[PDB]
Every structure is written in C-alpha cells, then in structure tokens.
C-alpha cells in the first residue's frame, strides 16, 4: 500500500472495486472524540417514567461530568410506538415512520435539557463535534436526540414497516463515528437475561456475552434493537457496549467508574 497507490485506485476504479476497498482499509484511523462516553437514556425505559426515574439520573449526570466527558442521547418511547401504530395502520412505509419517531426523541431531549440547563449542560445538534461544551470543566457533557438522520431514506426491515434503526442505533453510530471510548445503554432492567425478564419467570442473568453467542441463544432481538448487534460487529472503534439499569441509584455513575454492573456485549 501507499497514498499514491490508493489515490490511483480512487481515481481509476469504481468505489465497488475490491482492490480499491482493500487499499482504503489500510488508511490511518483517527478518533475524533476519544475521551468521550456516549450514553443512551431509554425513552420507554426511563424518560416515559417521569420524575422518579429521570431526576436521580439528572443528579448522576451532573455528578459524573466532573470526571467524565458525556454525550447523552435520548430514546423515544410510548409516543413513538403510538405514531408507528397509527402510520403502519394507514400503510405508510418505514421511511415515513422514521421521520415521525424523531419528533418524540426530540421532545425527550428538550425535557431532559431543561432539567440540565441550570447545570450548564446544553441540548445540541452535532454532539460529536460540540467542541466547546466538551472542552470545559463547567460543562463537559451535552444532550442530543438519539434517532438517526435517515428519515425517508431509512432502510426498511425484512418484514413490516417499523424503522429498524431507531435510538439504540442512532446513539451507537455516533459513538462509533466519533471514536468514543465507551457506549452505555441505560434501560430499565439489570442487563441481558436468557428471556425477557418482564414476561418470563426464571430468566437467568447474563453478565457478559458476544454477539455470536447472543444470536446462537436466540437473543438477537431482546434488550437492544437487533441491527445494533450487526453494526457492533462491523464497528472500527466501539467493539463492546454495556447495558445497565437506570432505575437503580448510582448505576450509571458506577458504570462510568469501570464497575461491571449490567451486561457487557462484545463484538467478538
């Protein structure tokens, strides 16, 4: 490989050419925001529960940003499920549902940002490149809306019209793109179990598992949107994620301190 070699392939071949694809893979790898942690705050699992779930998390974020740079993405929740139900019953395609679900993640970002404003933490568009707030000890965190930008260009799932890339995927891809050091999903269960702990009597807790092992055990579609497990296996930067229970006081703080609360899911 060389720069000049790559530049010739880039000029002379289709981008689909395996020889150009392999030369580009040899490029250097820059991490844009390597010292940041991306956290997703679940819509259904946390924000829809109101003050009893959100106020302790707000206190944890305020304490945590003293030691940890944070990008805090919001989930969507029950209002997006309602929009999806109305739109799917009309026969609208996945790209139209995708646009409707963004509005609900935005509402949640606005509500969380208003609780955080007097602590100096803004809601932003462009979290990964919100250079100023992330460089200041007074701030050191931003809130963003967790849906991806795909809108009408959303790829549909193999079946049905629910957008397959929603706020788990939005937050994950932002962590991956900006080369962040850690990705934490804040949900309302202690972590991954062998069955849905809400629906199932003797599900066993799983502290640590690989994407291949999850698929083999029939957990591809359990505590995270299932396409995230495939994005994780393709990821250059974030090769594991941690799922934690935001309802347990201090859980987010402990995960940020390196404690193994919850479940660690690894690409390999």
């Amino acid at each position: 490989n060389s720069t000049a070699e790559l530049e010739e392939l880039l000029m002379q071949r289709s981008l689909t050419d395996p020889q150009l694809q392999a030369a580009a893979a040899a490029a250097a790898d820059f991490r844009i925001l390597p010292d940041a942690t991306v956290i997703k705050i679940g819509g259904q699992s946390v924000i829809d529960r109101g003050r009893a779930a959100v106020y302790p998390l707000v206190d944890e974020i305020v304490a945590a940003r003293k030691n940890h740079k944070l990008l805090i993405g919001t989930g969507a929740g029950t209002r997006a499920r309602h929009l999806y139900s109305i739109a799917a019953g009309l026969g609208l395609p996945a790209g139209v549902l995708a646009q409707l679900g963004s509005s609900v993640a935005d509402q949640n970002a606005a509500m969380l940002g208003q609780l955080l404003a007097k602590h100096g933490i803004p809601v932003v568009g462009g979290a990964g490149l919100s250079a100023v707030p992330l460089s200041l000890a007074e701030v050191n965190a931003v809130v963003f809306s967790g849906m991806p930008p795909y809108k009408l260009w959303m790829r549909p799932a193999a079946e049905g019209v629910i957008p397959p890339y929603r706020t788990d995927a939005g937050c994950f891809l932002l962590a991956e793109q900006f080369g962040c050091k850690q990705m934490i999903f804040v949900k309302d269960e202690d972590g991954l179990y062998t069955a849905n702990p809400k629906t199932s009597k003797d599900a066993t807790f799983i502290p640590r598992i690989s994407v291949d092992e999850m698929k083999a055990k029939g957990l591809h579609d359990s505590i995270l949107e299932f396409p995230v497990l495939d994005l994780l296996q393709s990821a250059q930067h974030v090769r594991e994620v941690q799922v934690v229970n935001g309802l347990v006081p201090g859980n987010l703080t402990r995960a940020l301190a390196g404690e193994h609360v919850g479940t660690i899911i690894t690409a390999s």
């Binding site: 050419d17 026969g91 809108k151 790829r155």
Partner: protein, 244 residues
Amino acid sequence: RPIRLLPWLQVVKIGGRVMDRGADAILPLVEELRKLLPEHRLLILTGAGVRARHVFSVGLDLGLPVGSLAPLAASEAGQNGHILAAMLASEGVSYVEHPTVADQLAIHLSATRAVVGSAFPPYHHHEFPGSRIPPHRADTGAFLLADAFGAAGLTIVENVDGIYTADPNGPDRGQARFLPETSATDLAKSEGPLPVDRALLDVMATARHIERVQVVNGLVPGRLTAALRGEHVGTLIRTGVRPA
C-alpha cells in the same frame, strides 16, 4: 405492502461521472431532459463523480472515519445537482433540498414538471461502519427514495452501456461481457466491481414496490427517453419485488 405515496413519479439518477464529462455530455443530456419534461413528472437526482474521489483521498490521508467521508462526498452530488438545475432553469426546473424532497415533493411537482436533488441519502455521520468508503451512495439514495415513494420507476444514467462481467474500462476489460438483464441477488453474490453501489443490491432485497431498475448509457442520446418508456436499451436489474 405499504401504499405508494407518489405512484405517478419517475425518478432518474444521473451519474456523477457523466456530469464530470462537462458540456460535451451535459448539453445533449439537458436537451433530452427538456424534451422529456412534458411527458413525465420527474425527480432528477445527481451522483458525485470524481471530486468525491479527491475528497476521499484527502480525508483518508487525514485518517477520517467513514461517517466523516459520507457528507463530504454527498456535497459533490449536491453541486452536480445545482449545475444540472441551472441548465434547466429556463424550463422551470430548480434544485430542491433533501428535507424538501422528503416532505414536499408533491407540491413542488405540482408547481413544475421536474426538480433536481442530490442522490446521496442523508446517512452522514451515522453512515454504517465496516468499509472506509461510505456504502450508501447515489444509486442507493435514489433507490431508497424511488421505492419509499412507490414511484413508477428508477432509471440510472451511466457513462457505460450497463453492467458487464468485468469493468469494461479496467485491467480485465478484454473479457468484459455485457449483461442485458440480471437479478440483484445474482449480482450480490458475485465479487468484482459494478457500475452501481453494492448497497443498492441490499436495498433491492427489502424493496416493496420497484420491480426493475434499468442502467442505461446517458452518453447515447435517446436511451434515457427509451428507458423511461420501458424500452430495453441497457441492463435491467430485477429487484425481486413481485406484483401484489
């Protein structure tokens, strides 16, 4: 299956490497498009071409990840769309932005016969990882919109006759054979370069409406007009959608 939002729409994607040929390619295409305006309600989407290769060269040299490179390439497709729209302005055609395409295309095509937009989709810093080259490019963005709208067709305008068994301008061009018809699943399982994004074949596998996409040579006058009437003048790609 979902309803068709704009069943009367025809989508035409113009390759960035066609635009890169400058006036010698663009003026005849503009004349052909002018004559097509009374016949079809057209969303014309431009790809990126050689300037996106240069920004990839710089960006990859700087180490930038694939989500950084996706909007950098998309810019080049937007600029080609503004160039093409300016040439058609006297016929009422303008460039429209992605949010206008996604939410207001119906009113804009009620006002005028065609509009132009960027064929790249807004995946941006949420582009999928794996390759260092953004996978969801202009063919892919054009198909996602054509199929989401349930459009009457998508025609891809290339600087070659269609898909061959090898790059017909590359080191193995001597054994490149022309494919008049193929399926997306067949293409997806082959290795080797194509004149269309490999992501296009993936989005074809989940499509709900568009049954076939024709790739035709925009450097030959009249092929675009023939393809928009369903005439077989390039490579037909069957998506594997079936009639209801």
